[PDB]
Symmetry: D2
Amino acid sequence: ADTIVAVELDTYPNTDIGDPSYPHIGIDIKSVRSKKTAKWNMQDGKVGTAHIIYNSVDKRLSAVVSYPNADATSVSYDVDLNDVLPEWVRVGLSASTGLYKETNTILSWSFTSKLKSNSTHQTDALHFMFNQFSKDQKDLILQGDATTGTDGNLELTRVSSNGSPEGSSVGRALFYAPVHIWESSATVSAFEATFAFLIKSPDSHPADGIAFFISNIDSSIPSGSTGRLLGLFPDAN
Amino acid sequence: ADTIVAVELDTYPNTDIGDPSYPHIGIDIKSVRSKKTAKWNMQDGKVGTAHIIYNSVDKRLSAVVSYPNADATSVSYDVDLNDVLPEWVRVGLSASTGLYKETNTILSWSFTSKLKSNSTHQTDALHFMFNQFSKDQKDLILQGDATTGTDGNLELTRVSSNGSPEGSSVGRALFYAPVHIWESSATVSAFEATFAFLIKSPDSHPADGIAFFISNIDSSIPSGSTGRLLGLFPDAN
Amino acid sequence: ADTIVAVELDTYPNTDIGDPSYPHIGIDIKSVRSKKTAKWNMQDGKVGTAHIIYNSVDKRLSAVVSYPNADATSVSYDVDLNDVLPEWVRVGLSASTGLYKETNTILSWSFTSKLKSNSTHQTDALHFMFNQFSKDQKDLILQGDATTGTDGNLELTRVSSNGSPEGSSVGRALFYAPVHIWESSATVSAFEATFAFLIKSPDSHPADGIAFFISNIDSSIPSGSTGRLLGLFPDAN
Amino acid sequence: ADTIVAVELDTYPNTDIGDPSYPHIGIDIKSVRSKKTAKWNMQDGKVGTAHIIYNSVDKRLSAVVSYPNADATSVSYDVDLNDVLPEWVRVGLSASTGLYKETNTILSWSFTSKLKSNSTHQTDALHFMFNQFSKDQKDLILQGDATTGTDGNLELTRVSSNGSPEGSSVGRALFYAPVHIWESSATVSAFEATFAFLIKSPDSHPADGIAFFISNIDSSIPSGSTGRLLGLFPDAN
Ligand SMILES: [Ca+2]
Ligand SMILES: [Ca+2]
Ligand SMILES: [Ca+2]
Ligand SMILES: [Ca+2]
Ligand SMILES: [Mn+2]
Ligand SMILES: [Mn+2]
Ligand SMILES: [Mn+2]
Ligand SMILES: [Mn+2]
């Protein structure tokens, strides 16, 4: 009733769980215990951009977190979303804070996803494009402390009037229209997403990080999703 | 609180209103009293396909209802949706029946729509692709007697087990995610849609017709939307 | 100077090479000796549709040849196009005949391909859409006996005035604009293509088959590309 | 044999022709004598972005040249490209210099274009995406002094090693694949393009300007296309 696949950006390495010793990216299937991990070179206060693709033919969850001038960090995990995700899913954004401070602002957001059938070709599909959120932003489902329009951006985490990334925070947002994972006569399916993000830390010990996650249209933030729980996974591991 | 712009397919010409004397297409702004009209050559039991575009620069509501081998029928009206539609709209499908019988089945359905901002370029946008509806069809909002999956199609109107188009009927359906008409820093906006439809009449006196309409996320079928009221307009004219 | 990756549709099983004992699909890297194979259930005179995807993160050449009502046939091979294809490639269509007769008509043709950079996001990319070829068809590069506009279709192989698939034939066609495989600051690349095809055989012993292939902008049909050589590979194996 | 429709960015107002008295934008059909004009507020050394759309239903050439924080400048002209452009066209970029200096660098470039037929729906079409040009840039046709990869950008005009916009210059570039304006069974056609540009002037008296133009696959720069001739129109007016 509340299951999710997440692609997470980890700034604050919680050794106690199983994350490497520095900032890392990887795939989480069912829990905080990411299945695959990788090391990315944090650039505090710098502009970033994430990417993520997959499909049934191959069924391989892959990611690419890039930085300008800086070199690429990727990770790939083999999994059957067919077996994991609800036939119909929802797409949103999560970011987190707790003891540590950090900014979680989204500049641009893009989502592509299609479904190939038996009939002939070019069956079903959907796209959502973002470069600036509004005070309106009505085809979006925000959770908790997310803020849209702050500075004309999707700000997952709590911010002040001067910047000052707040702590002990948590919220998220998902596109209105559900998504279609797999189907009766579908033999070739696909998903594509990219997203620029902006993490800012006055501290050298930045918060927790960000995260792009897939779950049920019903997905809700659990208890103390705060902290390293990036509001993707309850206390279970 | 319940306003709409509609592109309608009129099979049953109700002289009493203002529709020409044979089947016609045109633009309806606020009421049944379509603003522009045109004559299209009905092909009962044959496969059809509608199209419709517009934008602010130009602000001209235009349409093209085609038939294979058959020649094109188009109509164009000058209007300010900026002035008419809610800043945030919804996209759906309507078809109608009353004293007259006719089929209103959708084979394929496509929706494209984008928003150009000041920042730089390629700001906001969305796409929805359809070639076959499901028993599921969960990212769709159906109204009344619409049926999804019947034969793997979106069937706006009431059908029997042998075909037999039902009469005195009415229903519709809209994509889940709202749409974004105009905005703060948007100076160049656009909308694009095409759709194949299938109207079937055992009778020579076919029902009412079909209709592609834009309204509020709140849009609901009025009283006796049945008949020529194609469930787009209440009794007001 | 003349290298290619091909996704081929094999109707006429030439045991002497290494193809299974019935019609099959698979990946060919450098030669006729396809690297991966699979069994698809031919439906002579019936409408078909092929699909094919891949990318660097994963680097896995995958395919899906479907038939309506009929079940799916797929194959997947792990390869480094980065290491194989010219930084800049060309996209076309090949089909073949020799001792055996068969039809090789294309109804629809679709090509999607993009390149993700370091700068920010949504870097480079291209699309080409086909549902009917012309007597014109000017942004297409046809080779040999291919015919465009015959019946408003791309007909790779030689046809008569009554149908009568010709034999001992060979030709192909590619989109004008070159394609961009990999690049300096590209860390996330992708390719997507689908295509409906129509193979017709008065005989029970149909020709050779079809094939979607990637090569150099310079790609030319070799000697006796005819036969099982599907005009993709010279005599080398 | 050499005809063109152009959307031009005019920095250097040549009163002697018919351009207003300050920088302006407008539509040129057959000649320098733009048919429609409008006033845009130049921002030297600042980042800009142009847009342009049209189609048969409506047949209205429209444009939007925007600047960040700054307000929009648009122009619209009614014309029959069906009657003017070759059934098959080419898409490129032009910029100009002469007595006056100015920079003409392109950051991003985007092209969308489709063709609706009788068959059913979603007939033909093409897309080209740009955010950074290469030393390679092989699916592009550059003319004269255009430079690709200079700083990872398409630089239409002649630049030095320190910047120093050169004078008395002229060149352009077009996408490889031709374009399809109108056709046999096409009743609903469309074209869409946006583009960010960067004009830089050490002087207060900047060169000539930029220009997005449509012509024949054969289009070549005429004599002294230099100057206000923005290399779009020969000496004829
Ligand atoms: Ca952690
Ligand atoms: Ca009527
Ligand atoms: Ca063979
Ligand atoms: Ca001038
Ligand atoms: Mn972790
Ligand atoms: Mn009417
Ligand atoms: Mn073989
Ligand atoms: Mn001028």
